[PDB]
Short mmCIF file of all heavy atoms in Angstrom, two decimals:
data_model
loop_
_atom_site.label_atom_id
_atom_site.label_comp_id
_atom_site.label_asym_id
_atom_site.label_seq_id
_atom_site.Cartn_x
_atom_site.Cartn_y
_atom_site.Cartn_z
N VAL H 1 113.47 63.70 73.68
CA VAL H 1 113.73 64.56 74.74
C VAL H 1 115.20 64.84 75.04
O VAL H 1 115.79 64.34 76.03
CB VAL H 1 113.08 64.06 76.08
CG1 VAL H 1 113.54 62.65 76.33
CG2 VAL H 1 113.35 64.98 77.27
N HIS H 2 115.82 65.43 74.07
CA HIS H 2 117.21 65.97 74.25
C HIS H 2 117.08 67.43 74.67
O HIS H 2 116.70 68.27 73.80
CB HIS H 2 118.06 65.79 73.00
CG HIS H 2 118.24 64.33 72.59
ND1 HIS H 2 117.62 63.89 71.42
CD2 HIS H 2 118.86 63.30 73.17
CE1 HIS H 2 117.93 62.56 71.32
NE2 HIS H 2 118.66 62.22 72.34
N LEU H 3 117.56 67.72 75.90
CA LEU H 3 117.73 69.17 76.29
C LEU H 3 119.15 69.47 75.94
O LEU H 3 120.09 68.72 76.15
CB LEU H 3 117.43 69.26 77.80
CG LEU H 3 115.93 69.61 78.12
CD1 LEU H 3 114.98 68.88 77.31
CD2 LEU H 3 115.72 69.38 79.60
N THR H 4 119.35 70.72 75.43
CA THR H 4 120.74 71.22 75.23
C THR H 4 121.26 71.44 76.66
O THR H 4 120.50 71.44 77.65
CB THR H 4 120.69 72.64 74.54
OG1 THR H 4 119.96 73.47 75.32
CG2 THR H 4 120.14 72.51 73.14
N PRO H 5 122.54 71.67 76.82
CA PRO H 5 123.14 71.93 78.12
C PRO H 5 122.44 73.18 78.71
O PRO H 5 122.22 73.17 79.90
CB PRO H 5 124.62 72.21 77.77
CG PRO H 5 124.89 71.33 76.59
CD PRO H 5 123.59 71.35 75.75
N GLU H 6 122.17 74.22 77.93
CA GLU H 6 121.51 75.43 78.39
C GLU H 6 119.98 75.12 78.86
O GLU H 6 119.58 75.64 79.86
CB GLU H 6 121.50 76.53 77.36
CG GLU H 6 122.85 77.13 77.14
CD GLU H 6 122.83 78.33 76.17
OE1 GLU H 6 121.90 78.46 75.38
OE2 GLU H 6 123.89 79.03 76.14
N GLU H 7 119.35 74.22 78.13
CA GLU H 7 118.02 73.82 78.57
C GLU H 7 118.08 73.02 79.86
O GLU H 7 117.27 73.27 80.75
CB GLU H 7 117.30 72.99 77.43
CG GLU H 7 116.75 73.88 76.35
CD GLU H 7 116.46 73.05 75.04
OE1 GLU H 7 116.69 71.87 75.00
OE2 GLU H 7 116.08 73.71 74.06
N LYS H 8 119.04 72.02 79.91
CA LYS H 8 119.27 71.30 81.19
C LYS H 8 119.55 72.28 82.32
O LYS H 8 119.04 72.10 83.43
CB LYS H 8 120.50 70.37 81.00
CG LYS H 8 120.25 69.22 79.94
CD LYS H 8 121.43 68.27 79.96
CE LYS H 8 121.57 67.42 78.76
NZ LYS H 8 122.78 67.98 77.95
N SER H 9 120.41 73.25 82.09
CA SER H 9 120.76 74.20 83.14
C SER H 9 119.54 74.93 83.67
O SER H 9 119.32 74.93 84.91
CB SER H 9 121.82 75.16 82.59
OG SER H 9 122.31 75.98 83.64
N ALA H 10 118.76 75.38 82.74
CA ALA H 10 117.55 76.13 83.12
C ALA H 10 116.55 75.30 83.97
O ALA H 10 116.14 75.77 84.95
CB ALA H 10 116.79 76.66 81.83
N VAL H 11 116.40 74.07 83.58
CA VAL H 11 115.46 73.17 84.28
C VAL H 11 115.95 72.85 85.71
O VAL H 11 115.25 73.11 86.65
CB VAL H 11 115.17 71.92 83.51
CG1 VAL H 11 114.30 70.96 84.39
CG2 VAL H 11 114.48 72.16 82.24
N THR H 12 117.16 72.38 85.85
CA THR H 12 117.69 71.85 87.06
C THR H 12 117.82 73.02 88.08
O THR H 12 117.49 72.86 89.25
CB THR H 12 119.02 71.08 86.97
OG1 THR H 12 120.04 71.91 86.36
CG2 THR H 12 118.82 69.85 86.06
N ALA H 13 118.32 74.15 87.66
CA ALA H 13 118.54 75.31 88.52
C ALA H 13 117.22 75.62 89.16
O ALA H 13 117.11 75.83 90.42
CB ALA H 13 119.14 76.47 87.82
N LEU H 14 116.14 75.86 88.37
CA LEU H 14 114.86 76.26 88.93
C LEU H 14 114.32 75.11 89.84
O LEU H 14 113.76 75.33 90.90
CB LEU H 14 113.87 76.49 87.79
CG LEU H 14 112.65 77.23 88.27
CD1 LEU H 14 112.99 78.69 88.55
CD2 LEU H 14 111.57 77.13 87.16
N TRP H 15 114.53 73.86 89.36
CA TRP H 15 113.89 72.75 90.10
C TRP H 15 114.45 72.52 91.49
O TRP H 15 113.77 71.95 92.34
CB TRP H 15 114.05 71.46 89.27
CG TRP H 15 113.15 70.34 89.71
CD1 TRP H 15 113.48 69.25 90.41
CD2 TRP H 15 111.76 70.36 89.46
NE1 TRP H 15 112.35 68.45 90.56
CE2 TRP H 15 111.26 69.09 90.02
CE3 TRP H 15 110.85 71.11 88.80
CZ2 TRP H 15 109.90 68.72 90.01
CZ3 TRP H 15 109.49 70.77 88.77
CH2 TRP H 15 109.10 69.59 89.40
N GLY H 16 115.73 72.92 91.68
CA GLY H 16 116.30 72.79 93.02
C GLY H 16 115.65 73.72 94.02
O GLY H 16 115.75 73.49 95.21
N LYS H 17 115.00 74.78 93.54
CA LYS H 17 114.24 75.72 94.35
C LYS H 17 112.84 75.33 94.63
O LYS H 17 112.14 76.07 95.39
CB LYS H 17 114.44 77.14 93.81
CG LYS H 17 115.91 77.71 93.88
CD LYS H 17 115.92 79.19 93.44
CE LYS H 17 116.72 79.38 92.20
NZ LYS H 17 116.90 80.81 91.86
N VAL H 18 112.31 74.32 94.00
CA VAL H 18 110.94 73.92 94.15
C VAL H 18 110.62 73.34 95.43
O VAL H 18 111.39 72.44 95.94
CB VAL H 18 110.60 72.94 93.00
CG1 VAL H 18 109.26 72.15 93.34
CG2 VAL H 18 110.54 73.62 91.64
N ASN H 19 109.55 73.75 96.07
CA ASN H 19 109.09 73.11 97.27
C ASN H 19 108.30 71.86 96.98
O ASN H 19 107.09 71.88 96.59
CB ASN H 19 108.18 74.08 98.06
CG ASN H 19 107.71 73.48 99.48
OD1 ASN H 19 107.62 72.29 99.60
ND2 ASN H 19 107.39 74.42 100.39
N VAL H 20 108.95 70.70 97.11
CA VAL H 20 108.42 69.43 96.73
C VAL H 20 107.22 68.95 97.56
O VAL H 20 106.52 67.97 97.25
CB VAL H 20 109.54 68.33 96.77
CG1 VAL H 20 110.72 68.80 95.93
CG2 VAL H 20 109.91 68.06 98.17
N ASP H 21 107.01 69.64 98.72
CA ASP H 21 105.75 69.20 99.49
C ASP H 21 104.57 69.93 99.18
O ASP H 21 103.49 69.67 99.67
CB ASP H 21 106.20 69.41 101.06
CG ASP H 21 107.21 68.44 101.49
OD1 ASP H 21 107.11 67.22 101.31
OD2 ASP H 21 108.20 69.02 102.08
N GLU H 22 104.65 70.93 98.26
CA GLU H 22 103.57 71.86 97.99
C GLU H 22 103.18 71.96 96.47
O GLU H 22 102.04 71.93 96.17
CB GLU H 22 103.91 73.26 98.46
CG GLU H 22 104.25 73.33 100.04
CD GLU H 22 103.04 72.92 100.93
OE1 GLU H 22 102.03 72.50 100.39
OE2 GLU H 22 103.20 72.92 102.13
N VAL H 23 104.21 72.06 95.62
CA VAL H 23 103.99 72.28 94.17
C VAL H 23 103.11 71.20 93.58
O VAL H 23 102.35 71.51 92.68
CB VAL H 23 105.34 72.53 93.41
CG1 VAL H 23 105.17 72.35 91.94
CG2 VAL H 23 105.90 73.90 93.70
N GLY H 24 103.41 69.99 93.92
CA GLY H 24 102.65 68.83 93.42
C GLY H 24 101.12 68.94 93.73
O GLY H 24 100.24 68.70 92.81
N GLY H 25 100.75 69.30 94.94
CA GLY H 25 99.44 69.44 95.34
C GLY H 25 98.77 70.60 94.75
O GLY H 25 97.57 70.58 94.35
N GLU H 26 99.53 71.68 94.53
CA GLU H 26 99.04 72.87 93.87
C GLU H 26 98.69 72.47 92.45
O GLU H 26 97.64 72.89 91.92
CB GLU H 26 100.14 73.94 93.86
CG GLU H 26 99.67 75.22 93.30
CD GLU H 26 98.67 75.95 94.26
OE1 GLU H 26 98.64 75.61 95.46
OE2 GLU H 26 98.00 76.89 93.77
N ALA H 27 99.54 71.72 91.74
CA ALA H 27 99.28 71.34 90.32
C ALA H 27 98.06 70.44 90.14
O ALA H 27 97.24 70.62 89.31
CB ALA H 27 100.51 70.81 89.71
N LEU H 28 97.99 69.38 91.01
CA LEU H 28 96.87 68.45 90.97
C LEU H 28 95.58 69.18 91.32
O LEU H 28 94.55 69.03 90.56
CB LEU H 28 97.05 67.31 91.90
CG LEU H 28 95.88 66.29 92.00
CD1 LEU H 28 95.70 65.51 90.69
CD2 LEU H 28 96.07 65.31 93.13
N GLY H 29 95.51 69.94 92.34
CA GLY H 29 94.42 70.73 92.75
C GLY H 29 93.93 71.59 91.57
O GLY H 29 92.71 71.52 91.21
N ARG H 30 94.84 72.32 91.01
CA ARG H 30 94.48 73.23 89.89
C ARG H 30 93.88 72.38 88.73
O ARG H 30 92.91 72.80 88.05
CB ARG H 30 95.64 74.11 89.45
CG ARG H 30 95.92 75.24 90.35
CD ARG H 30 97.08 76.12 90.03
NE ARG H 30 97.28 77.19 90.98
CZ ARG H 30 96.85 78.44 90.84
NH1 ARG H 30 96.10 78.81 89.78
NH2 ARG H 30 97.10 79.31 91.74
N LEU H 31 94.47 71.24 88.49
CA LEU H 31 93.96 70.39 87.41
C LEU H 31 92.48 70.11 87.71
O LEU H 31 91.70 70.22 86.77
CB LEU H 31 94.82 69.04 87.34
CG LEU H 31 94.24 68.07 86.26
CD1 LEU H 31 94.87 68.45 84.90
CD2 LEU H 31 94.65 66.68 86.69
N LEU H 32 92.12 69.70 88.93
CA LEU H 32 90.79 69.21 89.21
C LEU H 32 89.78 70.39 89.23
O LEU H 32 88.57 70.17 88.91
CB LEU H 32 90.72 68.51 90.60
CG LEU H 32 91.65 67.35 90.86
CD1 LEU H 32 91.69 67.03 92.33
CD2 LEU H 32 91.04 66.07 90.10
N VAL H 33 90.28 71.55 89.49
CA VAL H 33 89.54 72.79 89.46
C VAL H 33 89.31 73.24 87.98
O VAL H 33 88.17 73.51 87.63
CB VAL H 33 90.07 73.87 90.28
CG1 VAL H 33 89.44 75.25 90.05
CG2 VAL H 33 90.02 73.51 91.81
N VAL H 34 90.43 73.28 87.28
CA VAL H 34 90.34 73.92 85.87
C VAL H 34 89.75 72.95 84.82
O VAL H 34 89.08 73.36 83.95
CB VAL H 34 91.79 74.30 85.37
CG1 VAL H 34 91.72 74.92 83.96
CG2 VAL H 34 92.39 75.35 86.35
N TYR H 35 89.98 71.64 85.01
CA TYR H 35 89.47 70.60 84.15
C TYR H 35 88.66 69.59 84.98
O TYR H 35 89.19 68.42 85.22
CB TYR H 35 90.61 69.93 83.29
CG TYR H 35 91.53 70.99 82.74
CD1 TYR H 35 92.80 71.16 83.20
CD2 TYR H 35 91.18 71.74 81.61
CE1 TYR H 35 93.65 72.07 82.71
CE2 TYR H 35 92.02 72.65 81.12
CZ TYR H 35 93.26 72.86 81.57
OH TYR H 35 94.19 73.81 81.10
N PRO H 36 87.46 69.98 85.31
CA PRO H 36 86.65 69.23 86.31
C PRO H 36 86.38 67.81 86.07
O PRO H 36 85.97 67.02 86.94
CB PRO H 36 85.33 70.04 86.32
CG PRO H 36 85.72 71.41 85.88
CD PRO H 36 86.89 71.22 84.94
N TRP H 37 86.49 67.35 84.72
CA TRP H 37 86.21 65.99 84.39
C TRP H 37 87.26 65.05 85.07
O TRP H 37 87.01 63.91 85.29
CB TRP H 37 86.21 65.67 82.90
CG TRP H 37 87.39 66.11 82.11
CD1 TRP H 37 88.52 65.32 81.89
CD2 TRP H 37 87.65 67.42 81.52
NE1 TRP H 37 89.42 66.07 81.17
CE2 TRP H 37 89.00 67.32 80.93
CE3 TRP H 37 86.91 68.57 81.49
CZ2 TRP H 37 89.53 68.42 80.24
CZ3 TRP H 37 87.53 69.68 80.70
CH2 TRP H 37 88.79 69.55 80.15
N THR H 38 88.48 65.64 85.28
CA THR H 38 89.46 64.82 85.91
C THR H 38 89.13 64.43 87.34
O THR H 38 89.74 63.51 87.90
CB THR H 38 90.87 65.62 85.98
OG1 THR H 38 90.57 66.86 86.56
CG2 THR H 38 91.47 65.76 84.65
N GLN H 39 88.06 65.14 87.87
CA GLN H 39 87.53 64.76 89.25
C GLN H 39 86.91 63.31 89.19
O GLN H 39 86.54 62.79 90.29
CB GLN H 39 86.53 65.76 89.77
CG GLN H 39 87.13 67.16 90.01
CD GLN H 39 86.03 68.15 90.49
OE1 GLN H 39 84.99 67.71 90.99
NE2 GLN H 39 86.32 69.44 90.39
#
């Protein structure tokens, strides 16, 4: 897992704009809906 400086830049810039109270629940929820065995 070596990100180039440009890859690092891309990740961190977007990540700073992430709503940390919502995106996680959105992803878990979708997981349980899309791949029901995870339930």
